[PDB]
Amino acid sequence: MYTTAQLLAANEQKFKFDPLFLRLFFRESYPFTTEKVYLSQIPGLVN
Amino acid sequence: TSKETFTHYQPQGNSDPAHTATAPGGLSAKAPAMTPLMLDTSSRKLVAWDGTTDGAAVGILAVAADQTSTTLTFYKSGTFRYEDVLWPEAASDETKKRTAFAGTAISIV
Amino acid sequence: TSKETFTHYQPQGNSDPAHTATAPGGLSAKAPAMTPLMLDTSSRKLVAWDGTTDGAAVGILAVAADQTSTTLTFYKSGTFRYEDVLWPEAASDETKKRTAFAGTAISIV
Questions:
Q1: Region annotation Disordered: residue ranges (chains B, C)?
Q2: I need a labelling partner for B80 at 20 to 30 A (CA). Which of A10, A33, B1, C109 fits?
């Protein structure tokens, strides 16, 4: 039982990740107050 | 449940200092710690003491070794218990085992 | 021109003590220091070790003497190196020269 066996290191080496997208293209968040969403756009093309 | 034993290990039984030295060993087995040894008759290398060659117990092994070990280290002095040191099975008499190392600095109790 | 290297002298090889002892001598001739000895089968006198007889190693003389000295002083214990101790030319095998002093308080490295 002479196994006192001190531990001294807690290395993780878990993961590698960085989004960059939410802070690059979607700097704005719009929470929903309703059940649905409504997104639209008007194109411009004229002779 | 997990009731095991942790036994204190003291090869020495007296205040006599024990001393070690090495010599080219011709071991032909897997000798563990605290094994008696003898000198060979023809090549006079070092081998495990079989217990049969009377009066030829040279020394007591210090650290385990094998064939790859060209030379072996062993105690040259000191006093040791009768039970702590393992013995060859051929050495099946207590008196022979006890007095085997008489005449050297190696002593047994 | 003349290149000489001073060398520290360490006849011993290990911290184990070397104990001297004086005994009646039957030395053949002038034997310098660090010389192995043996006991005569017949006269039981101390004569320089031949280098042939197995187990004849008993001790190593301390201070150089000759045949005119009735008593000789020699180390009965300790450890010494291989190259420093001079040997009779008979012991022409390094392993034998090493394990010549086995079984006693005299040890070699």
A1: 1-27
A2: C109
